Scaffold this active site. Structure first.
Site, short mmCIF file in Angstrom:
data_model
loop_
_atom_site.label_atom_id
_atom_site.label_comp_id
_atom_site.label_asym_id
_atom_site.label_seq_id
_atom_site.Cartn_x
_atom_site.Cartn_y
_atom_site.Cartn_z
N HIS A 1 59.58 60.95 -77.68
CA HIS A 1 59.83 61.85 -76.56
C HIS A 1 61.29 62.28 -76.52
O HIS A 1 61.59 63.44 -76.22
CB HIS A 1 59.42 61.22 -75.24
CG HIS A 1 59.57 62.18 -74.11
ND1 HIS A 1 58.60 63.12 -73.83
CD2 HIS A 1 60.61 62.44 -73.30
CE1 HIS A 1 59.04 63.90 -72.85
NE2 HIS A 1 60.25 63.50 -72.51
N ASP B 1 62.71 66.00 -76.35
CA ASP B 1 63.73 66.48 -75.41
C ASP B 1 64.86 67.21 -76.12
O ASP B 1 65.29 68.29 -75.70
CB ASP B 1 64.33 65.30 -74.63
CG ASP B 1 63.45 64.81 -73.49
OD1 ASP B 1 62.51 65.52 -73.07
OD2 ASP B 1 63.75 63.69 -73.00
N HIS C 1 70.46 64.31 -72.06
CA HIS C 1 70.61 65.75 -71.87
C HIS C 1 72.07 66.17 -71.81
O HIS C 1 72.44 67.23 -72.32
CB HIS C 1 69.89 66.19 -70.59
CG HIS C 1 68.42 65.92 -70.61
ND1 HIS C 1 67.55 66.51 -71.52
CD2 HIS C 1 67.66 65.13 -69.83
CE1 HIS C 1 66.33 66.08 -71.29
NE2 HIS C 1 66.36 65.25 -70.26
N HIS D 1 60.98 70.61 -71.61
CA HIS D 1 59.72 70.38 -72.31
C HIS D 1 59.06 71.69 -72.72
O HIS D 1 58.59 71.83 -73.86
CB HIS D 1 58.79 69.53 -71.44
CG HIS D 1 59.41 68.24 -71.03
ND1 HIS D 1 59.33 67.74 -69.74
CD2 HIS D 1 60.15 67.35 -71.73
CE1 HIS D 1 59.99 66.59 -69.68
NE2 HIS D 1 60.48 66.32 -70.88
C1 LIG Z 1 62.97 60.14 -70.47
C2 LIG Z 1 64.14 60.78 -69.77
O1 LIG Z 1 64.88 59.81 -69.01
C3 LIG Z 1 65.03 61.41 -70.83
F1 LIG Z 1 66.03 62.01 -70.19
F2 LIG Z 1 65.57 60.42 -71.52
C4 LIG Z 1 63.71 61.89 -68.82
N1 LIG Z 1 62.75 61.36 -67.88
C5 LIG Z 1 63.13 61.11 -66.61
O2 LIG Z 1 64.28 61.21 -66.22
C6 LIG Z 1 62.11 60.52 -65.66
C7 LIG Z 1 62.59 59.80 -64.56
C8 LIG Z 1 61.69 59.19 -63.71
C9 LIG Z 1 60.33 59.27 -63.94
C10 LIG Z 1 59.43 58.54 -63.09
C11 LIG Z 1 58.66 57.89 -62.44
C12 LIG Z 1 57.70 57.09 -61.73
C13 LIG Z 1 56.46 56.85 -62.31
C14 LIG Z 1 55.51 56.09 -61.65
C15 LIG Z 1 55.79 55.55 -60.41
C16 LIG Z 1 54.70 54.76 -59.68
N2 LIG Z 1 54.94 53.30 -59.70
C17 LIG Z 1 55.14 52.77 -61.05
C18 LIG Z 1 55.25 51.25 -61.03
O3 LIG Z 1 54.17 50.63 -60.38
C19 LIG Z 1 54.04 51.10 -59.07
C20 LIG Z 1 53.83 52.61 -59.03
C21 LIG Z 1 57.03 55.79 -59.82
C22 LIG Z 1 57.99 56.55 -60.48
C23 LIG Z 1 59.84 60.01 -65.01
C24 LIG Z 1 60.74 60.65 -65.86
C25 LIG Z 1 63.12 63.08 -69.59
O4 LIG Z 1 62.04 63.04 -70.18
N3 LIG Z 1 63.83 64.21 -69.57
O5 LIG Z 1 63.30 65.29 -70.28
ZN LIG Z 2 61.61 64.66 -71.40
#
Ligand SMILES: C[C@@](O)(C(F)F)[C@H](NC(=O)c1ccc(C#Cc2ccc(CN3CCOCC3)cc2)cc1)C(=O)NO
Ligand SMILES: [Zn+2]
Ligand SMILES: [Cl-]
EC number: 3.5.1.108
Length: 269
Positions: free
Chosen positions: A225, A229, A252, A73
């Site tokens: 998003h 990425d 990725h 990011h």
């Molecule tokens: C988006 C991606 O997968 C991309 F790789 F594709 C990647 N993101 C990621 O790989 C990635 C993976 C996991 C998470 C998370 C979380 C999470 C968020 C809230 C809670 C809380 N609970 C929610 C429900 O109600 C009860 C409470 C738990 C867990 C964020 C991000 C990217 O941005 N990489 O740069």
């Molecule tokens: Zn990301």
């Protein structure tokens, strides 16, 4: 354009999305020809594909036993602003996730740019290329402008979505947050990731619902998003990139595969 650094030191801090730990960054000015590099515990880690050590749910870099998680990011923001010379000092194990988007980095760095005295040597895609992995694919072809399209096929109410960034539309992707699906949360935690994720920094979606009370920032926020990425992973070529890219369900791992194939083509040119 001209090579660019920051005028003064800039600091950011907060929890990291995967480690759940609090970390601090200091962005330092650097002279022409330095490149983008991280600095941790006395070790410089260039923001280049040779230093990638992990690509599952984040892009992580390492050198000489020092690792930094989730560089995509901050690197995307620096790519979009064409900041070419800078040291990102990291006190901790991961880049802060902040609100889940690039916005806080982007706004602070944009107001703090120092033009330098030589032109950027862009990484210019010279011919078409395709890489594939089990139904996912990424294509690239020559273009005078950076243009990046992501097409996703989501297994919930979002269905099929597609979004294209072109130069000049940076504000359309720097606010798009990272996202997660509720049925995948348990597995992500079991494999040792996501420890910092919350509804304050992640768009969380179910099969039929949106957990965040504030809702989506854009109806296609997830694919915006994913474009963001990919633009960060492309900066692992070591220079701002000119080419037209299309990713179908890429992540990725496939992004870095494309970067490594492109770098091999122009190793000596
Ligand atoms: C988006 C991606 O997968 C991309 F790789 F594709 C990647 N993101 C990621 O790989 C990635 C993976 C996991 C998470 C998370 C979380 C999470 C968020 C809230 C809670 C809380 N609970 C929610 C429900 O109600 C009860 C409470 C738990 C867990 C964020 C991000 C990217 O941005 N990489 O740069
Ligand atoms: Zn990301
Ligand atoms: Cl090429």
């Amino acid at each position: 354009g001209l090579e660019k650094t920051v005028k003064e030191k800039l600091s950011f801090e907060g929890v990291g999305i995967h480690t759940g730990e609090y970390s601090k960054l200091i962005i330092h000015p650097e002279k022409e020809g330095t490149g983008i590099r991280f600095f941790k515990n006395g070790v410089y880690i260039p923001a280049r594909h040779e230093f990638v050590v992990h690509t599952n749910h984040s892009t992580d870099l390492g050198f000489k036993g020092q690792r930094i998680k989730t560089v995509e990011h901050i690197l995307s923001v620096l790519h979009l602003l064409e900041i070419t010379n800078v040291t990102i000092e990291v006190i901790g194990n991961e880049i802060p996730i902040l609100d889940g988007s690039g916005w806080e980095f982007y706004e602070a760095i944009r107001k703090n740019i120092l033009n330098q005295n030589r032109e950027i040597d862009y990484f210019v895609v010279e011919e078409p290329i395709i890489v594939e992995d089990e139904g996912r694919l990424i294509k690239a072809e020559p273009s005078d402008t950076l243009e990046v399209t992501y097409e996703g096929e989501f297994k919930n109410f979002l269905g099929r979505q597609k979004f294209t960034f072109v130069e000049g539309n940076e504000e359309e992707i720097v606010l798009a947050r990272t996202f997660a699906f509720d049925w995948e949360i348990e597995h992500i935690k079991k494999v040792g990731l996501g420890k910092g994720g919350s509804l304050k920094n992640t768009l969380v979606l179910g099969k039929d619902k949106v957990y965040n009370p504030e809702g989506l920032r854009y109806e296609n926020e997830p694919v915006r998003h994913k474009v963001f990425d990919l633009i960060g992973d492309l900066y692992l070529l070591g220079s701002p990139v000119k080419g037209k890219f299309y990713s179908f369900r890429g992540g990725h791992s496939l992004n870095v595969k494309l970067v490594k194939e492109l770098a091999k083509k122009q190793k000596l040119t």
